[PDB]
Coordinates of C-alpha atoms in Angstrom, one line a residue:
Chain A
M1 CA 11.7 43.5 47.6
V2 CA 15.1 42.5 49.6
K3 CA 14.8 40.0 53.2
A4 CA 12.2 41.3 55.5
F5 CA 12.3 37.8 56.5
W6 CA 13.3 37.6 60.0
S7 CA 12.1 40.7 61.2
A8 CA 8.4 39.7 60.3
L9 CA 8.2 36.7 61.9
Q10 CA 9.4 38.2 64.8
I11 CA 6.9 41.1 65.0
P12 CA 3.4 39.1 66.2
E13 CA 1.4 41.9 63.9
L14 CA 2.5 40.0 61.2
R15 CA 3.2 36.3 62.4
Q16 CA -0.8 36.1 63.0
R17 CA -1.7 36.7 58.8
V18 CA 2.3 34.1 57.9
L19 CA 0.3 31.1 61.0
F20 CA -3.4 32.3 59.3
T21 CA -2.2 31.8 55.9
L22 CA 0.0 28.6 56.8
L23 CA -3.4 27.5 57.8
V24 CA -5.2 28.1 55.6
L25 CA -2.6 26.0 53.1
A26 CA -2.8 23.4 55.4
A27 CA -6.6 22.1 54.6
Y28 CA -6.8 23.8 51.0
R29 CA -4.2 20.4 50.7
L30 CA -6.1 18.3 53.0
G31 CA -8.7 19.3 51.4
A32 CA -7.0 18.1 48.6
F33 CA -6.8 14.8 49.7
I34 CA -11.7 14.4 49.8
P35 CA -11.8 12.7 46.2
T36 CA -15.0 13.7 43.9
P37 CA -16.9 10.8 45.0
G38 CA -17.6 7.9 41.7
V39 CA -14.3 8.9 40.7
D40 CA -11.7 6.2 40.1
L41 CA -8.3 8.3 41.0
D42 CA -5.9 5.3 40.2
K43 CA -6.7 5.6 36.4
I44 CA -6.7 8.1 36.7
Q45 CA -2.6 8.9 37.7
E46 CA -2.4 5.8 35.1
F47 CA -3.5 7.9 32.0
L48 CA -1.2 11.1 32.6
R49 CA 1.1 8.4 31.8
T50 CA 0.4 8.1 27.7
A51 CA 0.7 11.2 25.4
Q52 CA -2.7 11.7 25.1
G53 CA -2.6 12.0 29.2
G54 CA 0.8 14.4 28.8
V55 CA -1.1 16.8 27.4
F56 CA -2.9 17.5 30.6
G57 CA 0.5 18.5 32.5
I58 CA -0.2 21.6 31.7
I59 CA -3.5 21.7 33.5
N60 CA -2.7 19.4 36.0
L61 CA -0.2 21.7 37.3
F62 CA -2.5 24.9 37.6
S63 CA -4.7 22.7 38.9
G64 CA -2.4 22.2 42.5
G65 CA -1.9 18.7 41.8
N66 CA -5.6 18.0 42.6
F67 CA -7.0 16.5 39.2
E68 CA -5.1 13.5 38.9
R69 CA -5.9 12.9 42.8
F70 CA -9.9 14.4 41.4
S71 CA -10.2 16.5 44.5
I72 CA -12.9 19.0 45.5
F73 CA -11.2 21.4 44.5
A74 CA -10.2 19.4 40.7
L75 CA -9.7 22.4 38.9
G76 CA -8.6 25.3 41.5
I77 CA -9.0 29.2 40.8
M78 CA -9.2 28.4 37.0
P79 CA -12.4 28.6 36.6
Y80 CA -12.3 31.6 38.2
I81 CA -9.7 32.7 36.7
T82 CA -10.9 32.0 33.3
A83 CA -14.0 33.4 34.3
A84 CA -12.2 37.1 35.2
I85 CA -10.7 36.2 32.1
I86 CA -14.0 36.8 30.8
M87 CA -15.3 39.5 33.1
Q88 CA -12.5 41.3 31.0
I89 CA -13.9 40.8 27.9
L90 CA -17.6 41.4 28.3
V91 CA -16.5 44.2 29.8
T92 CA -14.9 45.6 26.7
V93 CA -17.7 44.1 25.3
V94 CA -20.9 46.0 26.2
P95 CA -20.6 48.9 28.3
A96 CA -24.0 48.2 30.7
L97 CA -21.4 46.9 33.3
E98 CA -18.9 50.2 32.7
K99 CA -21.1 52.4 33.6
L100 CA -22.3 51.2 36.8
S101 CA -17.9 50.4 36.5
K102 CA -17.9 54.4 35.7
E103 CA -20.6 54.8 38.6
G104 CA -18.0 54.1 41.5
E105 CA -17.2 51.8 43.1
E106 CA -20.3 50.6 43.9
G107 CA -20.4 49.0 40.2
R108 CA -16.7 47.5 41.1
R109 CA -18.2 45.9 43.5
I110 CA -21.3 44.6 41.4
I111 CA -18.7 43.6 38.3
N112 CA -16.6 41.9 41.6
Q113 CA -19.4 40.1 42.1
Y114 CA -20.5 39.0 38.8
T115 CA -17.5 37.4 38.4
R116 CA -17.6 34.9 41.4
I117 CA -20.7 34.0 40.0
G118 CA -19.4 33.3 36.5
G119 CA -16.4 31.3 38.7
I120 CA -18.6 28.7 40.5
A121 CA -20.8 29.1 37.6
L122 CA -17.4 27.7 35.7
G123 CA -17.3 25.3 38.5
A124 CA -20.4 23.9 37.8
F125 CA -19.6 23.9 33.9
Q126 CA -16.6 22.4 34.0
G127 CA -17.6 19.8 36.0
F128 CA -20.9 18.6 34.4
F129 CA -19.1 19.2 31.3
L130 CA -15.6 17.1 32.2
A131 CA -18.1 14.6 34.2
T132 CA -19.9 13.7 30.6
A133 CA -17.6 13.6 28.3
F134 CA -14.1 12.7 30.3
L135 CA -15.3 10.3 32.4
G136 CA -18.3 8.5 30.8
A137 CA -17.2 8.3 27.0
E138 CA -14.4 5.3 26.9
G139 CA -16.9 4.6 28.9
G140 CA -16.8 3.8 33.0
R141 CA -12.8 4.0 31.8
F142 CA -12.3 6.3 34.5
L143 CA -16.2 5.7 36.8
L144 CA -15.2 3.4 40.8
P145 CA -17.1 0.3 40.3
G146 CA -20.9 0.1 40.6
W147 CA -21.3 4.0 39.8
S148 CA -23.0 4.6 36.2
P149 CA -22.7 7.4 33.6
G150 CA -26.1 8.5 33.5
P151 CA -27.5 11.8 35.6
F152 CA -26.4 10.6 39.3
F153 CA -23.0 10.3 37.9
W154 CA -23.3 13.8 36.6
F155 CA -25.8 15.7 39.2
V156 CA -23.0 14.2 42.4
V157 CA -20.2 15.8 40.2
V158 CA -21.8 18.6 39.5
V159 CA -22.7 19.3 43.8
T160 CA -19.3 18.9 44.6
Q161 CA -17.6 20.6 42.1
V162 CA -20.2 24.0 42.8
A163 CA -19.7 24.3 46.3
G164 CA -15.5 22.4 46.1
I165 CA -14.9 26.2 43.8
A166 CA -17.2 28.4 45.7
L167 CA -15.1 27.3 49.0
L168 CA -11.5 27.7 47.8
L169 CA -13.1 30.8 46.2
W170 CA -13.8 32.1 50.1
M171 CA -10.9 30.6 50.6
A172 CA -9.2 32.6 47.9
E173 CA -10.7 35.3 49.6
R174 CA -9.8 35.1 53.1
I175 CA -5.8 34.3 52.4
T176 CA -6.4 38.1 50.9
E177 CA -8.1 40.2 53.8
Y178 CA -6.6 38.3 57.4
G179 CA -3.5 37.2 55.7
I180 CA -0.5 38.3 53.4
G181 CA -0.9 38.6 49.9
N182 CA -2.6 38.1 47.2
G183 CA -5.5 34.8 48.7
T184 CA -5.6 33.5 45.0
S185 CA -1.6 33.7 43.8
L186 CA -0.9 32.1 46.5
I187 CA -2.5 29.7 46.4
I188 CA -1.6 29.0 42.3
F189 CA 2.1 29.5 44.1
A190 CA 1.2 26.7 46.9
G191 CA 0.0 24.4 44.0
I192 CA 2.9 24.4 42.2
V193 CA 5.9 25.0 45.1
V194 CA 3.9 21.5 46.8
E195 CA 5.0 19.5 43.8
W196 CA 8.8 20.4 44.2
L197 CA 9.6 18.2 47.3
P198 CA 8.6 15.3 46.2
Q199 CA 10.5 15.8 42.5
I200 CA 13.9 16.2 43.9
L201 CA 13.9 13.3 46.7
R202 CA 12.8 11.3 43.6
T203 CA 15.8 12.8 41.2
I204 CA 18.4 12.3 43.8
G205 CA 16.2 8.5 44.5
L206 CA 17.3 8.1 40.3
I207 CA 20.7 9.3 41.2
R208 CA 21.8 6.1 42.7
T209 CA 20.4 3.5 40.6
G210 CA 23.0 5.0 37.7
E211 CA 20.1 6.2 35.8
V212 CA 19.6 10.4 36.3
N213 CA 23.6 11.6 35.6
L214 CA 24.5 13.5 39.2
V215 CA 26.1 15.9 36.8
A216 CA 22.7 17.1 35.2
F217 CA 20.7 16.9 37.8
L218 CA 23.3 19.1 39.7
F219 CA 23.6 22.0 36.3
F220 CA 20.1 21.5 36.4
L221 CA 19.6 22.9 40.1
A222 CA 22.3 25.0 39.5
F223 CA 20.1 27.0 36.2
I224 CA 17.2 27.3 38.6
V225 CA 19.5 29.5 41.4
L226 CA 20.7 31.5 37.9
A227 CA 17.5 31.7 36.8
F228 CA 16.6 33.0 41.0
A229 CA 20.0 35.0 40.6
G230 CA 17.9 36.9 37.2
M231 CA 14.9 37.1 38.5
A232 CA 15.8 38.7 40.4
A233 CA 17.8 41.5 39.7
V234 CA 15.5 42.4 36.2
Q235 CA 13.0 42.9 38.3
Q236 CA 14.8 45.0 40.3
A237 CA 16.0 47.0 37.9
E238 CA 14.5 51.0 36.7
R239 CA 15.3 53.9 34.4
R240 CA 15.4 56.9 36.8
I241 CA 14.3 60.3 35.5
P242 CA 15.9 63.2 36.6
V243 CA 13.3 66.0 37.9
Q244 CA 14.7 70.0 38.7
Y245 CA 11.7 72.2 40.9
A246 CA 11.5 74.5 41.6
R247 CA 14.0 77.1 42.9
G248 CA 11.9 79.9 44.3
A249 CA 8.2 79.9 46.3
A250 CA 6.7 77.0 43.6
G251 CA 9.0 74.4 45.3
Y252 CA 12.0 73.9 46.9
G253 CA 11.5 70.6 46.7
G254 CA 12.6 69.0 48.8
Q255 CA 11.4 65.9 46.9
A256 CA 12.6 62.7 45.2
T257 CA 14.4 63.7 42.0
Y258 CA 13.8 61.5 39.4
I259 CA 11.0 58.6 38.7
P260 CA 11.3 55.6 38.6
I261 CA 10.3 53.1 35.8
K262 CA 10.7 49.6 35.6
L263 CA 10.6 46.5 33.4
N264 CA 8.2 44.2 35.6
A265 CA 5.1 45.9 37.7
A266 CA 6.3 43.2 39.0
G267 CA 2.4 41.7 38.7
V268 CA 1.8 37.9 39.1
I269 CA -1.3 38.5 37.1
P270 CA -0.3 38.4 33.1
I271 CA 1.5 34.3 33.0
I272 CA -1.8 33.5 34.9
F273 CA -4.0 35.2 32.3
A274 CA -1.5 34.0 29.9
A275 CA -1.6 29.9 31.3
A276 CA -5.4 30.4 31.4
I277 CA -5.2 31.1 27.5
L278 CA -3.2 28.5 26.9
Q279 CA -5.2 26.3 28.5
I280 CA -8.5 26.7 27.4
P281 CA -7.6 25.2 23.7
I282 CA -6.8 22.2 25.9
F283 CA -9.6 22.1 27.9
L284 CA -11.8 22.3 25.4
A285 CA -10.3 19.6 23.3
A286 CA -8.5 17.0 26.2
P287 CA -12.0 15.4 27.0
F288 CA -12.5 13.9 23.6
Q289 CA -10.5 11.3 24.0
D290 CA -11.3 8.9 20.9
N291 CA -11.4 11.9 18.3
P292 CA -7.2 12.0 16.8
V293 CA -8.4 15.5 15.2
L294 CA -8.7 17.0 18.3
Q295 CA -6.1 15.3 20.0
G296 CA -3.8 16.8 17.8
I297 CA -4.7 19.8 17.9
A298 CA -4.4 20.2 22.1
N299 CA -1.0 18.6 21.6
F300 CA -0.3 22.0 19.3
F301 CA -0.6 24.4 22.3
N302 CA 1.4 21.7 24.1
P303 CA 4.1 24.4 26.4
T304 CA 6.5 21.1 25.9
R305 CA 6.7 20.5 22.1
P306 CA 8.5 24.0 20.1
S307 CA 4.2 25.6 19.0
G308 CA 3.1 25.0 22.3
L309 CA 5.9 26.4 23.7
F310 CA 6.0 29.1 21.2
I311 CA 2.7 30.3 21.4
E312 CA 4.2 30.2 25.8
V313 CA 6.5 32.3 24.7
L314 CA 4.3 34.6 22.8
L315 CA 1.7 35.2 25.3
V316 CA 3.8 36.0 28.3
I317 CA 5.5 38.6 26.8
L318 CA 2.1 39.6 24.9
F319 CA 0.7 40.3 28.3
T320 CA 3.8 41.2 30.5
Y321 CA 3.9 44.3 28.2
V322 CA 0.5 45.0 28.1
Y323 CA 0.2 44.9 31.8
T324 CA 2.9 46.2 32.8
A325 CA 2.3 48.9 30.6
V326 CA -1.4 49.7 31.6
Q327 CA -0.5 49.2 35.3
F328 CA 1.6 52.9 34.9
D329 CA -0.1 55.9 34.6
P330 CA 1.2 58.8 33.6
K331 CA -1.1 61.3 33.5
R332 CA -1.9 61.0 36.8
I333 CA 2.6 61.8 37.8
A334 CA 2.2 64.5 34.9
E335 CA -0.6 65.9 36.9
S336 CA 1.6 65.9 40.3
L337 CA 4.4 67.8 38.4
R338 CA 1.8 69.9 37.0
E339 CA 0.2 70.7 40.5
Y340 CA 3.4 70.3 42.8
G341 CA 5.8 72.4 40.2
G342 CA 7.4 70.0 38.6
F343 CA 9.4 70.0 35.4
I344 CA 11.7 67.9 33.8
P345 CA 14.7 69.5 32.2
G346 CA 14.0 69.7 28.6
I347 CA 10.5 70.6 28.4
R348 CA 7.1 72.6 29.0
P349 CA 5.1 70.3 31.7
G350 CA 1.3 68.4 30.4
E351 CA 1.1 66.8 27.6
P352 CA 4.4 66.7 26.4
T353 CA 5.5 64.8 29.3
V354 CA 3.2 61.8 28.8
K355 CA 4.3 62.0 25.7
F356 CA 7.6 61.0 26.5
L357 CA 7.2 58.7 29.5
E358 CA 5.1 56.9 26.8
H359 CA 8.2 57.8 24.9
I360 CA 10.7 55.7 27.3
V361 CA 8.6 53.3 28.3
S362 CA 7.8 51.9 24.8
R363 CA 11.1 51.7 24.0
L364 CA 11.9 49.7 27.8
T365 CA 9.4 47.3 28.1
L366 CA 10.3 45.2 25.1
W367 CA 13.3 44.2 26.6
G368 CA 11.5 43.2 30.1
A369 CA 8.6 41.0 28.4
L370 CA 11.9 40.0 26.0
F371 CA 13.7 39.0 29.6
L372 CA 10.5 37.1 31.1
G373 CA 9.6 35.5 27.6
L374 CA 12.9 33.5 27.7
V375 CA 11.9 32.9 31.5
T376 CA 9.2 31.2 29.0
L377 CA 11.7 29.6 26.8
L378 CA 14.8 28.2 28.6
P379 CA 13.7 25.6 31.2
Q380 CA 11.7 23.2 28.9
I381 CA 15.0 23.4 26.2
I382 CA 17.3 22.7 28.8
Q383 CA 15.5 20.1 30.4
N384 CA 15.2 18.5 27.0
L385 CA 18.9 18.2 26.5
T386 CA 19.5 17.7 30.2
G387 CA 17.8 14.1 31.8
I388 CA 15.8 16.4 34.5
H389 CA 12.0 16.9 33.0
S390 CA 9.2 18.0 34.9
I391 CA 6.7 20.5 34.1
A392 CA 6.6 21.4 38.1
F393 CA 9.9 23.0 37.2
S394 CA 8.5 25.3 33.7
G395 CA 9.4 28.5 33.5
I396 CA 6.1 29.3 34.0
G397 CA 5.9 27.5 36.7
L398 CA 9.5 29.5 38.2
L399 CA 7.9 32.8 36.7
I400 CA 4.7 31.9 38.6
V401 CA 7.4 31.2 41.7
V402 CA 9.2 34.3 41.7
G403 CA 6.3 36.5 40.7
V404 CA 4.8 35.3 43.8
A405 CA 7.4 35.4 45.9
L406 CA 8.7 38.8 45.1
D407 CA 5.0 40.2 45.1
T408 CA 5.3 38.8 48.6
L409 CA 8.3 39.2 50.3
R410 CA 7.6 43.0 48.5
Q411 CA 4.8 44.1 50.1
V412 CA 5.0 43.3 53.9
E413 CA 8.3 45.8 53.5
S414 CA 6.4 47.8 51.9
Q415 CA 4.1 47.6 54.8
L416 CA 6.5 47.6 57.7
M417 CA 7.9 50.6 55.6
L418 CA 4.3 52.5 55.9
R419 CA 4.5 51.5 60.0
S420 CA 8.0 53.1 60.1
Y421 CA 7.8 57.0 58.7
Chain B
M1 CA 14.3 45.2 8.9
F2 CA 11.7 45.1 6.7
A3 CA 10.2 48.9 4.5
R4 CA 9.8 50.9 4.8
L5 CA 9.1 52.3 9.5
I6 CA 12.8 51.9 10.1
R7 CA 13.5 49.8 12.8
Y8 CA 13.3 52.0 17.0
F9 CA 15.2 49.0 18.0
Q10 CA 17.4 51.5 18.9
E11 CA 15.7 53.3 20.0
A12 CA 14.3 50.8 22.0
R13 CA 18.7 50.1 23.0
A14 CA 20.0 53.7 23.7
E15 CA 17.3 54.2 26.1
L16 CA 18.4 50.5 27.4
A17 CA 21.9 51.8 27.3
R18 CA 20.3 54.5 31.1
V19 CA 19.6 52.3 32.1
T20 CA 20.1 52.3 35.9
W21 CA 20.8 47.7 36.9
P22 CA 20.3 47.5 40.9
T23 CA 23.8 46.5 43.1
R24 CA 25.2 43.4 43.8
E25 CA 23.9 43.8 47.8
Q26 CA 20.3 43.3 46.5
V27 CA 21.0 41.0 44.4
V28 CA 21.8 38.4 45.7
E29 CA 19.5 40.1 49.1
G30 CA 16.8 38.9 46.3
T31 CA 18.2 36.0 45.6
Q32 CA 18.6 34.6 48.8
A33 CA 15.1 36.2 49.6
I34 CA 13.2 34.8 47.4
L35 CA 16.0 31.2 48.5
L36 CA 14.8 31.7 51.6
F37 CA 10.3 32.1 51.0
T38 CA 10.2 28.8 48.2
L39 CA 12.5 26.9 50.5
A40 CA 10.4 27.5 53.5
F41 CA 7.5 27.0 51.8
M42 CA 7.3 23.6 50.0
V43 CA 8.8 21.9 53.0
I44 CA 5.3 23.2 54.8
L45 CA 3.5 22.2 52.1
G46 CA 5.8 19.0 52.0
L47 CA 4.6 17.9 55.2
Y48 CA 1.5 19.3 54.7
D49 CA 1.3 16.3 52.2
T50 CA 3.2 14.6 53.5
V51 CA 1.7 14.1 56.5
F52 CA -2.4 14.4 55.7
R53 CA -1.5 11.2 53.2
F54 CA -0.3 9.0 55.9
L55 CA -3.5 10.4 58.0
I56 CA -5.7 9.3 55.4
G57 CA -3.6 6.0 54.9
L58 CA -4.6 4.6 57.7
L59 CA -8.6 5.4 56.2
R60 CA -7.8 1.9 53.9
Chain C
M1 CA -30.4 2.3 51.9
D2 CA -32.7 3.5 49.5
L3 CA -34.2 6.0 52.1
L4 CA -31.4 6.4 53.8
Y5 CA -28.7 6.9 50.5
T6 CA -30.7 8.9 48.9
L7 CA -30.9 11.0 52.0
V8 CA -27.6 11.5 52.5
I9 CA -27.8 12.8 48.4
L10 CA -30.5 15.3 49.8
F11 CA -28.3 16.6 52.6
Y12 CA -24.9 16.5 50.1
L13 CA -27.3 19.0 47.8
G14 CA -29.0 21.6 50.7
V15 CA -25.1 21.0 52.4
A16 CA -23.2 22.6 48.7
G17 CA -25.9 25.3 47.5
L18 CA -26.6 26.5 51.1
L19 CA -22.5 26.9 51.2
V20 CA -22.7 28.3 47.5
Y21 CA -25.3 30.8 48.6
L22 CA -23.1 31.7 52.1
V23 CA -20.2 32.4 49.2
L24 CA -22.0 34.9 47.6
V25 CA -24.3 36.7 49.9
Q26 CA -20.1 37.1 51.7
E27 CA -18.3 39.5 50.2
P28 CA -14.7 40.8 50.7
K29 CA -14.3 44.2 51.7
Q30 CA -11.3 46.3 49.7
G31 CA -13.3 44.4 46.2
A32 CA -12.3 43.2 44.2
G33 CA -9.3 40.2 46.6
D34 CA -8.2 39.1 43.1
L35 CA -5.9 42.2 41.9
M36 CA -4.5 43.1 45.4
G37 CA -3.8 41.3 48.5
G38 CA -4.6 43.9 51.2
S39 CA -3.4 46.5 54.0
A40 CA -1.7 45.3 57.2
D41 CA -1.4 48.0 59.5
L42 CA -5.0 47.1 61.2
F43 CA -8.5 45.1 60.0
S44 CA -11.5 45.2 62.3
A45 CA -14.4 41.8 62.1
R46 CA -18.0 42.9 61.6
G47 CA -20.2 40.6 63.5
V48 CA -21.9 39.3 59.9
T49 CA -18.0 38.5 58.2
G50 CA -16.8 36.4 61.9
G51 CA -20.7 34.5 62.0
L52 CA -21.2 33.4 58.5
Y53 CA -17.8 33.2 59.0
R54 CA -18.0 30.3 61.6
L55 CA -21.6 29.0 59.7
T56 CA -20.0 28.5 56.6
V57 CA -16.5 27.3 57.8
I58 CA -18.6 23.7 59.5
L59 CA -20.8 24.1 56.9
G60 CA -16.8 23.0 55.0
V61 CA -16.3 20.5 57.0
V62 CA -19.3 19.2 57.2
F63 CA -19.0 18.9 53.4
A64 CA -15.9 17.9 53.5
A65 CA -16.6 15.1 55.9
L66 CA -19.8 13.8 53.7
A67 CA -17.8 14.2 50.3
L68 CA -16.2 10.8 52.0
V69 CA -19.3 9.1 53.0
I70 CA -20.2 9.4 49.6
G71 CA -17.0 8.7 48.2
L72 CA -17.2 5.9 50.2
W73 CA -19.9 4.4 50.4
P74 CA -20.7 0.4 49.2

């Protein structure tokens, strides 16, 4: 929530977690320099300059800058995120897995296993697909001299990317295990915030050459600060429903006399889901570079262009609202109230309580979702007005940064509170 | 705004008026916390990819 | 040059596949590791977990250096 930064670094117990996290991130960023055998990187970096390669930006941002360097983790954890989304879909469709999920955690572990396997298999599939379409349909426009666009190159790429996404997934799990915050979350966060410093540096370097107006950059940075303060102030906002109970032997309370309900859960999962969703058509249309129509429908979902930004905003709002609504279960709070003798002044403990809870939550979460949609919309507009242009400073990027930071800090502080009392 | 069901947006405003917003100190501390976190990881990762690039640069 | 290259490639495939097998066998306790962040009050290390850890790290580094080898073959 707030602070808990110095005390977390003083305590050796959390210091080990932090240093371990930094170590794994170091190994990640080091492994980000090991290129896929048989791939010309300079021509890719040169391809990402044109309008035909600009659409890759949204995909490049969530790769951790691995795409342009085509590392072993070329696609990042995004195949695993896509695998998780598809896993949600398949879970919804066929109840053969939901029965196992209803058989306890013993089925949940199965769901997890199949999710990960789906991730690795997606690594293989997407690797082979990119290698077949994007890398050698031109062909050989991105291939190193001495490398043929045959079965051998495809084999090498597949073998590389499979073990790549495998090792990366394992790393994420180890971060989730022996480190602060969520693994995949901190990894995506890292992959985004890595590019931040060179952007600022090159911008400052562009200021003195009379290329970029200093006022534009200053106003831009100020807008970043305002975004920070804004999301920080919204995430901590809450509605407090007073509950009085219970004079007699039923109580007495004795406990918290109010139920807090917030606009944000908060969760970094929604906008990541929406990110992958927005990336799928772009990732499926971009490899077929020579085809104009597919390039058109790919530019239709570009987060920079009005259309793609619109779709992105809708996705952010929708996913935020849905996730926030799902995470908060009225049933458990209500039965807790009934069992503890909790009585909210005005109604009777039971179904009408959850009905009223839904009645407030539904009217409440809307403004939060719309707010996150606003944070999704505004930065691209500012960039379109100001001189600065960077997808690393886009709406969804700021959403991810703020989200992950807040999540990690909140969790750590929560653990401190738990060890306290 | 359209027929025939009435705008429940008023409720969405009403239940927004009964919302307790965080204090000044909470906003300041939150902002400074996010800033500290982000700045820290940005500097550390920056140094990371920098020295990694400069180390790989020796392999030619 | 024909035998050598293909041998190194065989090692690439082998190390890759073995790494995949390892990370597939290794499931994070308190699953899944995508939803939550995990407890930070107390944690225990297992011999299977630790051993497969020490192994998969080595296989990881090996896969990296080997990727460099394949990536820099004249």
